[PDB]
Design a protein around this motif. Structure first.
Motif, mmCIF file in Angstrom:
data_model
loop_
_atom_site.group_PDB
_atom_site.id
_atom_site.type_symbol
_atom_site.label_atom_id
_atom_site.label_comp_id
_atom_site.label_asym_id
_atom_site.label_seq_id
_atom_site.Cartn_x
_atom_site.Cartn_y
_atom_site.Cartn_z
ATOM 1 N N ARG A 255 0.823 -1.204 0.000
ATOM 2 C CA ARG A 255 0.000 0.000 0.000
ATOM 3 C C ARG A 255 0.858 1.255 0.000
ATOM 4 N NH1 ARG A 255 -4.698 -0.109 4.229
ATOM 5 N NH2 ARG A 255 -2.904 -0.496 5.605
ATOM 6 N N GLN A 256 2.024 1.204 0.645
ATOM 7 C CA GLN A 256 2.910 2.361 0.668
ATOM 8 C C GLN A 256 3.661 2.543 -0.647
ATOM 9 O OE1 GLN A 256 4.384 5.683 1.392
ATOM 10 N NE2 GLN A 256 3.246 4.794 3.110
ATOM 11 N N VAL B 3 3.609 4.078 -8.155
ATOM 12 C CA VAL B 3 3.945 3.595 -9.489
ATOM 13 C C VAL B 3 2.707 3.494 -10.373
ATOM 14 C CG1 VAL B 3 6.000 2.383 -8.680
ATOM 15 C CG2 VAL B 3 3.814 1.167 -8.792
ATOM 16 N N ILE B 4 1.601 2.990 -9.820
ATOM 17 C CA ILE B 4 0.387 2.824 -10.615
ATOM 18 C C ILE B 4 -0.124 4.170 -11.107
ATOM 19 C CG2 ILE B 4 -1.242 2.968 -8.699
ATOM 20 C CD1 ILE B 4 -2.836 0.723 -10.033
ATOM 21 N N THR B 5 -0.016 5.212 -10.283
ATOM 22 C CA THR B 5 -0.503 6.540 -10.627
ATOM 23 C C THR B 5 0.532 7.368 -11.382
ATOM 24 O OG1 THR B 5 0.215 7.766 -8.665
ATOM 25 C CG2 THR B 5 -1.742 6.371 -8.449
ATOM 26 N N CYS B 6 1.529 6.727 -11.990
ATOM 27 C CA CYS B 6 2.564 7.441 -12.725
ATOM 28 C C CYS B 6 2.163 7.755 -14.162
ATOM 29 C CB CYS B 6 3.863 6.628 -12.726
ATOM 30 S SG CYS B 6 3.889 5.266 -13.913
ATOM 31 N N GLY B 7 0.989 7.314 -14.605
ATOM 32 C CA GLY B 7 0.554 7.563 -15.965
ATOM 33 C C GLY B 7 -0.582 8.559 -16.068
ATOM 34 N N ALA B 8 -1.457 8.578 -15.067
ATOM 35 C CA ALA B 8 -2.612 9.465 -15.067
ATOM 36 C C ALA B 8 -2.280 10.763 -14.344
ATOM 37 C CB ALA B 8 -3.810 8.789 -14.400
ATOM 38 N N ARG B 9 -2.554 11.888 -15.012
ATOM 39 C CA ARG B 9 -2.275 13.205 -14.453
ATOM 40 C C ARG B 9 -3.409 14.184 -14.737
ATOM 41 N NH1 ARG B 9 -1.230 18.031 -13.628
ATOM 42 N NH2 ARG B 9 -2.711 18.534 -15.305
ATOM 43 N N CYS C 187 -4.214 12.393 -10.218
ATOM 44 C CA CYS C 187 -5.012 11.533 -9.355
ATOM 45 C C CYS C 187 -4.100 10.757 -8.417
ATOM 46 C CB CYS C 187 -5.866 10.572 -10.182
ATOM 47 S SG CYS C 187 -4.992 9.142 -10.844
ATOM 48 N N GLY C 188 -4.521 10.643 -7.161
ATOM 49 C CA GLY C 188 -3.614 10.109 -6.174
ATOM 50 C C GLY C 188 -2.481 11.094 -5.934
ATOM 51 N N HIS C 189 -1.423 10.590 -5.302
ATOM 52 C CA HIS C 189 -0.250 11.407 -5.007
ATOM 53 C C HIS C 189 0.988 10.569 -5.288
ATOM 54 C CE1 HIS C 189 -2.345 14.522 -2.162
ATOM 55 N NE2 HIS C 189 -2.449 14.849 -3.438
ATOM 56 N N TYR C 190 1.670 10.873 -6.393
ATOM 57 C CA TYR C 190 2.874 10.145 -6.766
ATOM 58 C C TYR C 190 4.075 10.528 -5.909
ATOM 59 C CZ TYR C 190 7.157 9.301 -9.460
ATOM 60 O OH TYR C 190 8.430 8.952 -9.849
ATOM 61 N N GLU C 191 4.004 11.651 -5.188
ATOM 62 C CA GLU C 191 5.128 12.135 -4.397
ATOM 63 C C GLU C 191 4.731 12.537 -2.980
ATOM 64 O OE1 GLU C 191 4.195 13.354 -7.316
ATOM 65 O OE2 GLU C 191 3.060 15.142 -6.743
ATOM 66 N N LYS C 192 3.499 12.249 -2.552
ATOM 67 C CA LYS C 192 3.088 12.600 -1.197
ATOM 68 C C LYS C 192 3.744 11.710 -0.148
ATOM 69 C CE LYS C 192 0.507 15.284 0.053
ATOM 70 N NZ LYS C 192 -0.917 15.266 0.487
ATOM 71 N N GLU C 193 4.219 10.528 -0.537
ATOM 72 C CA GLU C 193 4.936 9.594 0.325
ATOM 73 C C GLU C 193 4.034 8.897 1.336
ATOM 74 O OE1 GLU C 193 9.009 11.632 1.341
ATOM 75 O OE2 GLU C 193 7.471 13.198 1.302
ATOM 76 N N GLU D 12 6.611 18.436 -9.052
ATOM 77 C CA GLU D 12 7.768 18.060 -9.857
ATOM 78 C C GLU D 12 8.727 19.231 -10.028
ATOM 79 O OE1 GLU D 12 8.582 15.107 -10.787
ATOM 80 O OE2 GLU D 12 10.383 15.704 -11.892
ATOM 81 N N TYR D 13 8.192 20.430 -10.249
ATOM 82 C CA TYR D 13 9.013 21.617 -10.487
ATOM 83 C C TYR D 13 9.324 22.329 -9.170
ATOM 84 C CZ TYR D 13 8.513 21.247 -15.545
ATOM 85 O OH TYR D 13 8.567 20.834 -16.856
ATOM 86 N N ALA D 14 9.982 21.595 -8.277
ATOM 87 C CA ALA D 14 10.352 22.135 -6.976
ATOM 88 C C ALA D 14 11.646 22.929 -7.088
ATOM 89 C CB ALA D 14 10.506 21.010 -5.954
#
Length: 1437
Positions: free
Chosen positions: A151-152, A157-163, A174-180, A301-303
């Protein structure tokens, strides 16, 4: 949560573990224990059509299972996003999370799959039992830990295609690819979620269908019949849904009746069931920070990337949804609303009253509006997460390929009206006189937001820079006592202010570094993970495509992009380039100084004004020192000591030197410094002697000469002081030390580590050694002085820049000689070294003496001129017709004055009687002559030269064809410093060999071009073979003689540089001494022509007919780095000097404008070469069949390095130009493209051919061939196939220099560790260990210094910025030492990280010396080497 980690394995049927650990979804089909085909077009949900089955003693541990589940999740996400079940973009990713939850429950949970679901659960149980073999804690615990880890992790990875969007607090994906952390968990009963999904789908379908029905009802104007039929069908569907709901209610009641840590999911489900049953904006500050949920800033991404100008944050569209303020509330209404918004926003833009500064602002606003409408915005203030959703909702009901393309097309179509309505436009016409005159209607600015923001920020900075420099120069224009320092100080504070407008109170250097890092990351992303490149049916619009376009153009770094985009040099008006880099000491703001290098405009002071704003003298010394040429890295009444510490690491006391029962102390450091200095300065002097506005060049050269002279004097004085100190309480003499150093330097390069019997030397090598190092007596001071004198006269010479008598009356004694031709008995070479045929017969039939000799030389010159004019095929190149094409510009024959000079030199030697091998009778004659009899010799030589000039003038007068007064190719006498007897004969032999080889090649190509041989090719090939054998013997003898005479220089370069005839001839190959050369290539580099056969490569599946036809030689391990054959400060690794490049030359020379066949010919040749190279390399790196993983890793690393070298050489990005490579590149350029085509076009074509086929690409073919070679190697020892060799995917190769540096540091660390362990464990073997240590370490210091200098030259340059047209923007490293950090810290993996060094700290520069790490064993090595030096001197004497 749990501490159980995973996803750390390596080579588990996949690419590599290094690719991962970066929180990416690059997992491919491999790495999951296998190498989803199941795709569809009580309850029956669609979970079956949105699930995979890719999931027995083959898995090592839980790493493989985790990788498999991650791959399954990634594949499911990719399938769902690509299929796009609902393109409305309102709810597209809810199904993604629903499927993810269902898959999570599939792992030993609620299983509803009606079918063959037994295999999956059986395999899952088997895996659980296997991983549970280790009993640690009393089944459920491990399952829950794995579930939490999944779950962590999988959520990233799954949400790496939908934006598209998300609901929840962040958005834009959708979701959080970088929220950790997980956003929302679907921990609800599967029945409820399935019912919710079913009702949502029914609602969406019925809603959109009834909307379409309502639109169609009015679209027409028997419609009533179909309307009623559809109404009846929908009523049927509604009643069916009601029946299904009743069935679900009945099932719920049945479960409730039945109900009246042990599957905690079911317990929570039942508990939940019981619970249920029971407008004006002020200025901005250039936000540089990431935007939060309710705060402005860049996206996740643009941090810390490019910031936002105040104009973007003041746009009206970024205020609320698409609804006007003055109003109370169709396809055409959108255009009206957009026009109204633009026309009302333009008044907000009238704030800036200008005629030039408003057009750019309007263009930027238009581009930002376009990018926001398209849906690729990043500024993302508090009013963007909802604006995108509103736009999607509006577009779904008005236009519902894809939605992004629809938005792009809409923007491209309506941009004309959008731009026209932004210039005070109320009555839109059909489409100067408007409120502004920015530009034409289109105003194309289709650029990614990042680049536009960068350009705007750069312009904003340049405005302030110009404003400051105007005042700075207005007061410091060569006028500066006290009123000029203030301007420079203020500019320095402004440029480096860790607290003007923009940057959010931070140094400009940090922001520039962040921008460069982001630009490099974009370049890598668009170059590595982008397959759909440019040239596609000129990319329409995409960030990756635009970055690929930029990389193809050459603007790899942001500096070049800024330089090209910016025009008129408005950045400061001082003409400061954006390409040059300026380095300043350090920034005090936020005791220790750290050099900071930035673009020239940033710098630290006005460009070209460094050390000028302070109102002092020009200081030519420092001004030239900044030029970075002719530099010496040394900082040389008490008269105690002068250490002369090397610039960098400071001298540190050994602390191990004692004066009690010892020799002395505090002087070993000076000895080591002198030992390093006497070699570094010698190498620098040699390099400057080998090397050639010149006024400043020699001014600085003389300054450097004076500096080194002062250093030499100080070193001599210090050495005298050391000798006196030693005599106080014996040490070798200073001249003796210099002689020993020269001998050791000469011996180490050639002899294998101070060969025992150094006395065994070639007969001629003694003369060279005595001339260079010195005679028997020690004369090091004299040799150094003469070297310095030669260096000075280098510039001293560089900075400087009648005949009436008739002598044709005595025509007797000499007649037409019998040259090598049949025009009416031909001589041949007799190999002293050799005797050319022309020397055997001359106009010496006659043999007062001076006149006779003058007449004889005049007659022989005239005869030679006549013979050459008549035409001959012995020295002049001509076709069958003869006397055409090959014509000298002066109008004289080819190679005439060369022969005249050769004959004059022979006559001079004969009259002088030097060491020349000639006929015995001629020897006695010249002996008697010189018995019978040196200014008069020079006078007589001048006399013959004047006579020759007079003869040439007479010939010109009698012919009257051109202007010739004795200057056909030079009036001065031969000034060749080297002996002109052996070398001249060697050059003449080489020229004759070139001519004969070219003639034979032409004859073979014109007579044996059009499968056995049955024509006349046998005779030609046999004659060529015999000639090649004879010339091979002659070349062997001559090369041995030359090496014995000149042991340093080579013969190939000398023979090919002074004669363009041998440019397609490879002496190393034509005269190979191997055995296979007489079997596989018996025709001498023309087997492909004499044989007229075809080449083919056989794979592993072939029969016994393997491919064992190669000239590969066993790899050698006792080589040293050499910088020869290179087109500065770069050394070639030993690996590149042993690659098999012999098989390519025959095919390369055979092909000419024959790409149709040359393509596959070169393909097969390269495949065979790569296979043989892999075989030999793996065998060398795995001797005696030892099963060591390190050996396999090193072999794989060598394989990858060789493969990258081959890729570079094929692509034309190679650095070395060897005998083979030069002609290979020449022929590759000649074949591909044409002469008219530019080199850039040919390079692009070569790159395209190497990348793509225009089945499998050439990259994959070569990789498969090399794996086949490794397998052929392995079958000989019956071992396991390496796991580092079964990987197909490979990342883009880094610049060859970086790979060379990495290999160099790896080898240096390995040797250092080995030698230190050998010495410490044994240290009466200290002598050998210390000697080997010093010998191996001394060259490494120079090598590292040169490599560091080259790194600093192009550390972060680009194509149009670096020394060569190569790509170096991926370096992103301040200094060379800092680059090796994080790259050579871990262990060896075989794919990317292949360097182990326990010297990560700033110790490489100190380790090169003996200051710190060799302190404990410094006195011992020194005091035991001293006797070694004394014994060597005694033996030499």
């Amino acid at each position: 949560l749990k501490a159980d980690p995973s996803e750390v394995e390596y080579y588990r049927s996949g690419g590599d573990g290094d690719y991962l650990k970066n929180n990416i979804c690059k997992i491919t089909v491999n790495h999951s224990d296998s190498g989803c085909e199941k795709k569809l077009p009580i309850c029956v949900p669609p979970r079956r059509e949105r699930l995979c089955t890719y999931n027995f003693d083959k898995i090592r541990d839980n790493n493989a299972f985790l990788a498999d589940v991650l791959l399954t999740a990634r594949n499911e996400g990719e399938k769902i996003v690509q299929n796009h079940p609902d393109t409305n973009s309102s709810n597209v990713c809810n199904a993604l999370e629903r499927s993810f939850a269902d898959l999570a429950d599939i792992i030993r949970g609620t299983d509803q799959w009606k079918g063959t679901n037994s295999n999956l659960e059986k395999n899952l149980k088997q895996m659980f039992a296997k991983i549970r073999e280790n009993d640690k804690v009393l089944y459920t615990k491990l399952r829950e830990a794995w579930w939490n880890a999944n779950r962590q992790k999988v959520w990233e990875v799954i949400t790496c295609g939908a934006r598209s969007n998300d609901l929840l607090e962040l958005c834009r994906k959708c979701g959080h690819y970088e929220k950790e952390v997980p956003t929302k968990l679907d921990y609800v009963p599967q029945f409820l979620r399935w019912l919710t999904e079913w009702i949502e789908d029914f609602y969406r379908e019925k809603q959109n269908l009834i909307d379409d029905m309502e639109r169609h009802r009015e679209e027409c104007t028997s419609y009533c019949s179909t309307c009623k039929d559809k109404c009846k069908k929908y009523c049927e569907c509604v009643k069916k849904w009601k029946t299904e709901w009743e069935n679900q209610e009945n099932k719920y009641k049945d479960l409730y009746e039945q109900n009246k840590n042990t599957s905690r999911y079911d317990d929570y489900v039942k508990d939940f069931f019981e619970k249920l049953e029971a407008t004006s904006r002020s200025k901005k500050k250039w936000i540089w920070k990431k935007s939060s949920g309710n705060e402005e800033g860049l996206q996740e991404e643009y941090a810390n990337t490019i910031g936002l100008p105040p104009r973007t944050q003041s746009l009206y569209l970024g205020n609320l949804p698409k609804l006007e303020n003055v109003c109370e509330d169709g396809c055409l209404i959108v255009s009206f609303h957009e026009g109204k918004n633009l026309k009302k926003r333009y008044p907000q833009n009238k704030n800036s009253g200008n005629k030039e500064n408003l057009c750019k602002a309007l263009e930027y606003s238009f581009a930002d509006y376009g990018d926001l409408i398209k849906g690729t915005s990043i500024w993302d203030n508090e009013y963007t997460k909802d604006l995108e959703l509103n736009l999607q909702n509006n577009f779904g009901k008005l236009f519902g390929s894809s939605l992004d393309e629809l938005r792009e097309s809409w923007w491209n179509t309506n941009k004309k009206y959008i731009w026209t309505a932004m210039k005070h436009g109320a009555e839109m016409n059909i489409t100067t006189g408007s409120g502004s005159s920015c530009d034409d209607i289109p105003t194309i600015d289709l650029i990614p937001q990042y680049l536009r923001f960068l350009q705007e920020w750069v312009e904003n900075f340049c405005e302030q820079r110009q404003a400051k420099v105007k005042d700075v120069i207005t007061n410091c224009k060569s006028c500066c006592k006290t009123k000029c320092k203030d301007e420079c100080e203020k500019y320095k504070k402004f440029i480096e202010a860790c607290g003007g407008i923009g940057t959010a109170g931070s140094p400009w250097s940090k922001r520039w570094d962040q921008i460069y890092k982001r630009y490099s990351k974009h370049i890598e992303d668009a170059k590595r993970n982008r397959k759909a490149g440019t040239k596609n049916c000129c990319v329409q619009s995409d960030i990756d495509s635009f970055f690929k376009h930029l990389i193809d153009i050459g603007l790899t770094t942001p500096s070049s992009y800024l330089s090209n985009v910016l025009d008129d040099n408005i950045c400061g008006a001082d003409k400061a380039p954006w390409t040059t880099y300026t380095t300043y000491t350090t920034t005090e703001k936020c005791d220790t100084l750290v050099v900071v290098n930035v673009p020239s405009p940033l710098g630290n002071t006005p460009y070209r004004y460094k050390y000028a704003c302070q109102c002092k003298i020009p200081t030519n010394e420092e001004t030239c020192d900044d030029r970075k040429e002719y530099m010496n890295q040394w900082s040389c009444k008490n008269d105690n000591y002068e250490l002369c510490k090397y610039n960098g690491v400071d001298v540190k006391p050994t602390t191990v030197r004692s004066n009690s029962s010892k020799l002395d102390g505090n002087d070993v450091t000076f000895f080591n410094l002198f030992e390093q200095w006497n070699k570094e300065i010698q190498y620098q002097i040699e390099q400057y002697m080998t090397n050639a506005n010149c006024k400043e060049k020699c001014k600085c050269y003389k300054l450097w000469i004076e500096k080194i002279n002062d250093q030499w004097g100080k070193q001599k004085d210090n050495y005298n002081k050391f000798r006196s100190k030693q005599i106080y309480d014996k040490v070798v003499s200073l001249s003796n030390f210099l002689f020993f150093s020269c001998w050791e330097e000469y011996i180490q390069k050639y002899f294998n580590g101070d060969w025992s019997k150094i006395k065994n030397i070639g007969s001629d090598t003694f003369e060279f050694l005595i001339k260079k190092c010195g005679n028997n007596s020690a004369h090091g001071e004299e040799i150094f002085n003469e070297k310095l004198k030669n260096a000075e006269k280098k510039c001293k010479e560089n900075e400087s820049t009648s005949c009436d008598l008739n002598a044709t009356n005595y025509i007797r004694g000499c007649q037409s000689k019998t040259y090598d031709g049949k025009i009416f008995g031909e001589k041949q070479w007799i190999c002293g070294a050799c005797i050319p045929p022309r020397t055997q017969n001359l106009c010496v039939g006659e043999l007062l003496l001076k006149e006779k000799i003058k007449n004889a030389i005049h007659k022989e010159t005239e005869l030679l001129y006549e013979y050459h004019d008549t035409g001959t095929a012995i020295i002049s190149k001509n076709d069958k017709k003869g006397q055409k094409g090959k014509n000298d510009p002066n109008g004289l024959p080819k190679g005439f004055c060369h022969a005249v000079q050769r004959s004059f030199i022979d006559y001079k030697n004969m009259i002088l009687g030097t060491s020349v091998n000639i006929y015995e009778h001629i020897g006695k004659l010249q002996e008697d002559i010189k018995k019978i009899i040196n200014a008069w010799w020079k006078g007589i030589e001048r006399e013959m030269w004047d006579a020759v000039r007079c003869a040439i003038t007479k010939i010109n007068k009698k012919n009257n064809n051109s202007i010739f007064n004795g200057d056909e190719c030079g009036v001065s006498p031969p000034t060749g410093n080297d002996e002109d007897q052996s070398v001249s004969w060697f050059k003449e032999w080489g020229e004759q060999f070139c001519i004969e080889r070219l003639r034979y090649e032409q004859n073979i190509r014109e007579a044996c071009t059009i499968d056995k041989i049955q024509g006349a090719c046998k005779r030609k090939c046999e004659k060529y073979k015999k000639y090649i054998s004879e010339k091979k013997q002659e070349w062997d003898k001559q090369k041995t003689k030359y090496e014995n005479k000149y042991v340093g220089k080579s013969a190939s370069d000398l023979l090919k540089e002074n004669y363009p005839e041998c440019i397609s001839a490879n002496f190393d190959f034509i005269f190979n001494d191997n055995i296979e050369y007489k079997t596989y290539y018996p025709y001498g580099d023309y087997s492909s022509i004499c044989s007229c056969e075809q080449v083919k490569y056989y794979k592993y599946n072939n029969a016994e007919k393997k491919n064992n036809k190669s000239l590969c030689y066993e790899k050698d391990n006792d080589m040293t780095w050499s910088k020869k054959y290179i087109k500065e400060g770069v050394y070639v690794p030993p690996r590149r000097q042993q690659l098999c490049l012999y098989e390519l030359f025959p095919i390369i020379i055979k092909n000419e404008e024959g790409m149709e066949k040359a393509k596959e010919e070169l393909l097969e040749t390269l495949q065979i070469v790569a296979e043989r190279e892999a075989y030999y390399l793996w065998k060398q790196y795995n001797p005696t069949g030892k099963g060591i993983d390190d050996a396999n890793k090193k072999a794989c690393c060598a394989i990858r390095g060789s493969f990258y070298d081959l890729e570079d050489i094929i692509k034309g990005n190679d650095l070395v130009h060897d005998e083979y490579t030069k002609y290979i590149d020449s022929k590759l350029n000649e074949i591909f493209g044409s002469s008219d085509t530019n080199d850039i076009d040919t390079k692009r074509a070569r790159t395209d051919w190497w990348e793509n086929e225009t089945r499998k690409t050439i990259r994959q073919l070569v990789w498969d061939a090399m794996q086949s070679g490794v397998r052929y190697a392995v079958e000989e020892k019956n071992e396991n196939f390496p796991l580092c060799m079964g990987v197909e995917h490979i990342g883009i190769a880094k610049p060859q220099f970086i790979r060379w540096l990495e290999e160099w540091t790896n080898e240096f660390c390995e040797k250092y560790t080995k030698y230190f362990e050998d010495m410490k464990s044994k240290c009466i073997e200290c002598k050998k260990a210390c000697a080997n240590y010093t010998n191996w370490l001394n060259p490494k210091r120079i090598e590292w210094n040169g490599m560091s200098n080259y790194y600093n030259k192009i550390y972060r340059k680009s194509n149009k910025e670096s020394e060569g047209g190569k790509d170096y923007s991926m370096i992103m490293a301040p200094t060379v030492i800092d680059y090796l950090n994080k790259r050579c810290h871990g262990e060896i993996n075989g794919n990317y990280i292949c360097c182990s060094c326990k010297n990560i700290g700033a110790y490489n520069t100190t380790s090169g010396t003996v200051n710190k790490k060799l302190q404990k064993k410094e006195t011992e090595c020194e005091e035991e080497k001293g006797p070694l030096d004394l014994m060597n001197e005694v033996l030499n004497k």
